[PDB]
Amino acid sequence: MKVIQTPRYLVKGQGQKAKMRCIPEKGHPVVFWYQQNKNNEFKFLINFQNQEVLQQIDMTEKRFSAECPSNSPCSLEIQSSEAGDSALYLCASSLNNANSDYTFGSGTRLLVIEDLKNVFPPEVAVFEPSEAEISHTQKATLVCLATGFYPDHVELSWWVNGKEVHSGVCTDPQPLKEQPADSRYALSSRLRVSATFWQNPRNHFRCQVQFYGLSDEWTQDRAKPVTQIVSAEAWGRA
Amino acid sequence: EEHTIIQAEFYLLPDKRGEFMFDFDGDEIFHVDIEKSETIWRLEEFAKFASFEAQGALANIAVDKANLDVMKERSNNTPDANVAPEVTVLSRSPVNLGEPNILICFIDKFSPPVVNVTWLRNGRPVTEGVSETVFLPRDDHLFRKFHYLTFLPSTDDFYDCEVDHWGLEEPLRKHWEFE
Amino acid sequence: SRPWFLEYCKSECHFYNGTQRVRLLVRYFYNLEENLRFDSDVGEFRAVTELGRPDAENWNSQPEFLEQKRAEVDTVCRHNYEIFDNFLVPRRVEPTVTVYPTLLVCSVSDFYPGNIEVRWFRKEEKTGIVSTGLVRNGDWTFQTLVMLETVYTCQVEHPSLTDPVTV
Amino acid sequence: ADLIAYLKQATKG
Amino acid sequence: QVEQSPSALSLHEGTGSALRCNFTTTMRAVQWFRKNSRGSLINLFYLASGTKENGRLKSAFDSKERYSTLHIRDAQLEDSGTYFCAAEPSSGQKLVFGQGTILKVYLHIQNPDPAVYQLRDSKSSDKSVCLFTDFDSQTNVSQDSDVYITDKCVLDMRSMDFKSNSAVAWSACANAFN
Ligand SMILES: *[C@@H]1O[C@H](CO)[C@@H](O)[C@H](O)[C@H]1NC(C)=O
Ligand SMILES: *[C@H]1O[C@H](CO)[C@@H](O)[C@H](O)[C@H]1NC(C)=O
Numbered sequence: 001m002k003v004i005q006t007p008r009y010l011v012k013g014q015g016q017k018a019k020m021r022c023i024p025e026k027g028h029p030v031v032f033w034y035q036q037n038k039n040n041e042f043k044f045l046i047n048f049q050n051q052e053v054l055q056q057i058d059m060t061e062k063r064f065s066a067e068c069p070s071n072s073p074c075s076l077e078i079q080s081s082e083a084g085d086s087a088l089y090l091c092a093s094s095l096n097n098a099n100s101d102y103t104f105g106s107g108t109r110l111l112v113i114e115d116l117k118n119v120f121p122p123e124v125a126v127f128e129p130s131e132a133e134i135s136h137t138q139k140a141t142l143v144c145l146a147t148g149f150y151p152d153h154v155e156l157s158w159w160v161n162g163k164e165v166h167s168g169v170c171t172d173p174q175p176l177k178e179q180p181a182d183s184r185y186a187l188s189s190r191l192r193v194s195a196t197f198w199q200n201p202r203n204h205f206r207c208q209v210q211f212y213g214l215s216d217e218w219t220q221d222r223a224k225p226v227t228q229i230v231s232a233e234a235w236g237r238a
Numbered sequence: 239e240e241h242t243i244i245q246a247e248f249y250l251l252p253d254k255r256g257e258f259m260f261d262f263d264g265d266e267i268f269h270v271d272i273e274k275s276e277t278i279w280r281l282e283e284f285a286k287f288a289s290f291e292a293q294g295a296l297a298n299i300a301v302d303k304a305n306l307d308v309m310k311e312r313s314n315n316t317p318d319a320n321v322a323p324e325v326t327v328l329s330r331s332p333v334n335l336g337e338p339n340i341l342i343c344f345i346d347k348f349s350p351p352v353v354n355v356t357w358l359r360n361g362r363p364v365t366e367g368v369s370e371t372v373f374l375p376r377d378d379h380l381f382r383k384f385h386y387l388t389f390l391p392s393t394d395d396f397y398d399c400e401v402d403h404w405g406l407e408e409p410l411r412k413h414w415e416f417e
Numbered sequence: 418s419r420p421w422f423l424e425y426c427k428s429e430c431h432f433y434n435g436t437q438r439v440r441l442l443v444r445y446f447y448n449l450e451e452n453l454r455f456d457s458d459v460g461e462f463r464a465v466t467e468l469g470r471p472d473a474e475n476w477n478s479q480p481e482f483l484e485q486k487r488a489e490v491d492t493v494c495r496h497n498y499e500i501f502d503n504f505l506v507p508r509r510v511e512p513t514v515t516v517y518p519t520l521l522v523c524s525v526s527d528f529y530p531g532n533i534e535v536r537w538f539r540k541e542e543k544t545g546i547v548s549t550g551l552v553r554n555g556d557w558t559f560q561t562l563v564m565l566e567t568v569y570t571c572q573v574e575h576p577s578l579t580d581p582v583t584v
Numbered sequence: 585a586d587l588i589a590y591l592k593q594a595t596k597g
Numbered sequence: 598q599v600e601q602s603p604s605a606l607s608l609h610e611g612t613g614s615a616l617r618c619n620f621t622t623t624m625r626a627v628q629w630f631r632k633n634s635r636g637s638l639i640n641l642f643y644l645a646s647g648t649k650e651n652g653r654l655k656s657a658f659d660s661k662e663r664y665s666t667l668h669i670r671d672a673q674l675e676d677s678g679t680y681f682c683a684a685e686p687s688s689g690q691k692l693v694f695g696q697g698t699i700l701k702v703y704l705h706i707q708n709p710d711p712a713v714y715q716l717r718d719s720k721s722s723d724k725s726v727c728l729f730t731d732f733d734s735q736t737n738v739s740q741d742s743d744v745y746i747t748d749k750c751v752l753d754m755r756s757m758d759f760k761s762n763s764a765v766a767w768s769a770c771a772n773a774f775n
Contacts, residue, residue: 029595030595032692034692036694040679040681040694040696040697041694042692042693042694044691044692047297047690047691049300049301049304049595050304052300052303052304053300054296054297054300054301054690055293055296055297055690055691088636090638095479095482095595096476096479096482096594096595097297097301097592097593097594097595098482098485098486098591098592098593098594098595099479099481099482099485100485100625100626100628100643100645100684100685100692101481101485101626101628101643102628102683102692103640104630104638104640105637105638106635106636106637106638107636107637107638109636125718125719125720125724126718126719126720127716127717127718127719127724127725127726128716128717128718128719129716130714130715130716130728132712132714132715133712133714133728133730136710136712137710137712137731139754141714141716141728141730141763142716143716143726143728143765145726145765145767167753167754167755167756168752168753168754168755169752170750170751170752170753170763171634171750172747172748172750173634173748173750174748176745176747176748178745186745188726188747188765190728190750190752190763190765191752192752192754192761193754194757232719232720233719234719235719239432239434239435239506240432240433240434241431241432241498241506242429242430242431242432243429243430243432243494243497243498243501244427244428244429244430245427245428245429245430245590245591246425246426246427246428247425247426247428247593248423248424248425248426248446249423249424250421250422250423250424251421251422251423252421252422253421260588260590262501262505263530263531264553265553265555265556265557266555267501267505280556280557281556281557283504284504285585286585287500287503287504287585288500288501288504288585288586288587288588289585289586289587289588290587290588290590290688291587291688291689293689293690294590294592294688294689294690295590297592297593297690298590298592298593299593301592301593301594301595302424302426302593303424304595304596304597305424305593305595305596305597306422306423306424308596308597309422309424309447309468309596310422312468312471313447313468315420315422317420317421317422318420318421318448318449318450319418319449320418320419320421321449328552330526330527330554330558330560331513331526331527331560332515332517332524332526342554342555344555349423349448349449350421350423350448351423371555374555375427379425379446379449379450379451384554384555384556386555386556404418404419404421405418426593428590428591443591472596475596476594481643481645482594484626484644484645484646485625485626485645487645487646488625488626488645488646488660489591489625489687491646491660491661492589492623492624492625492626492645492660492687493589493590493591493687495661496589496623496687497588497589500586500588587622587686587688587689588688589623589686589687589688590687590688592690
């Protein structure tokens, strides 16, 4: 296999426990947990060979709880989240404790906020190719917009005729703030196809945005802004 | 300049005891107190010239523990005979009445690396001015160990070094007088 | 008697001429028996007994492990020598010499390193000499008793002495 | 007081 | 500690450069990773000595001289991302990372055709965004009030051996990109 970390994103209010899951490579007994901040500074947190801890820092001992239960995914749980716990949690596996050849996973992007209250899913819209572009270039460019979501924990993908696509696609490097003065976020993505392909009514376009939110307890009038998929559709007109 | 540095480590069952030490030309440089998790230098003056993160030793140990279980299952848990030590007692310097000296109990060529040692003055155990070393490695598979007794040479006192091991039928005692 | 189970490992760094020629020897022991070796001159793991064969199989099939192993001659063996060469290698403790009759006895004690020469002069005497041999004290000092059968000078030479010591 | 290097024990099994 | 140089790099397609990591002590080995847009650390290299070639990248490592190098040749869009070196001092069980190098591969726009189109929402003719597209790499894009303007980003229409840049603004399309 390969190192698999979940959830890819996570959000918690101060005081809440924040658990993170990790599955090592197949036949990899050694597991590491590192912490990376936004300044790209890494910090060793704990180390495992199978179920037994090889080493850990003083912080992890007090504030963290970590296990690698047999036939079970290694886990790392913060017992009481703080704003300073916000960082990327990298898990890495190894075949041999002697070895220094580590394989890192995707990681879990944890964010700690005062209260979940500001957690809003994205609103997603798809905008159809302009007649001007079609005639001038014979190419059709769709634009997707995800707006008013928080935190900026989203995964955007394009789906065409029942299949994810990467060719002709490009997505903004990072979601921007709708108001720089915290804030709610927005993100756009482009999918470009030949004018003909767009003009074919047998072709179906969908912009699919995965949102990472709550699971959990919700005490507010509106619907629970849970981890969900918000999507938008467009059709091939001729 | 022909020298040898030895990183010697092990884990022992069913005693559940481990060790991590370094050795230079036959003498211990340091070892790690696993329980207190710290580097213990053989001579205090060594600390000024080097350092060693004790954490690494505890890590290795844990892996030694794991490997031991592997080795046990691989050999069907097939036990093995014990090897009894050869005990020898001698002063550190020429002995003069009234002049502070040191008795050395030398336990050698034995395994497993687990023994109880007792200093005896006139048949009575001694808990004052007694030192010991961890289990030191030899060229071979067997172990070595030193125990030290601080004393004041008199014609009235006699000493014994009692060593208990699983290879022996009964605790072995080596005698020493000023005579 | 009582069963016991020992996982015992020695990671040996050998130096023939300081850092001139360095050799790494990793030796694995189970109970009373050495079962596996890694000799940097061979660059590979080699079982010594049946028991070490599975390990040899496994580790030798790990390219990056063998790779990191071969490097440890430098990462670990060389790295440490430069450190110890500062205090351990150049260590010198002058011997204390004493002559007394029990059979005359030359007592050479409290010295380091081990190499030493103890000679009896009556002209030198190559007869009626027996010694306990070199004795390690366990505390970075050696001692030895060289005895001359008589019915007299004792000379000592040692790396800690520019000029020999006499009686 | 430089830091002494050591071999990390290898995993069996 | 690990001094990794440089901090950032911009490479036009098919050009080359070198990264470097300097160490303050003896490392057991070195490793190079690339964090892609996703943030997933693609493993690039492991080596305890000497050199290794893997495609358009080659890495070297000298534990005695306390340095490691990563060379890139014939740069491609796929090479973009932040590169990190990582190494274990031979005195520890823990890894140490460099500050990283942000690499960015500039695409070559053969036939530049800048233009700003307007797109209607597929669900309602009420909403609309502005698409600035087909400009060349030279060009840049700035950010007023409720008016949003994403950074730029290039897409690759492989089936036509065609590539283009684009940016999006939303809040008239004539004034949006001044
Ligand atoms: C031993 O090492 C020294 C110093 O590097 C060197 O000058 C000498 O030639 C070497 N001796 C031998 C036996 O090669
Ligand atoms: C050493 O002494 C301890 C405690 O007195 C005892 O439990 C152990 O069995 C002894 N080991 C032997 C018998 O050599």
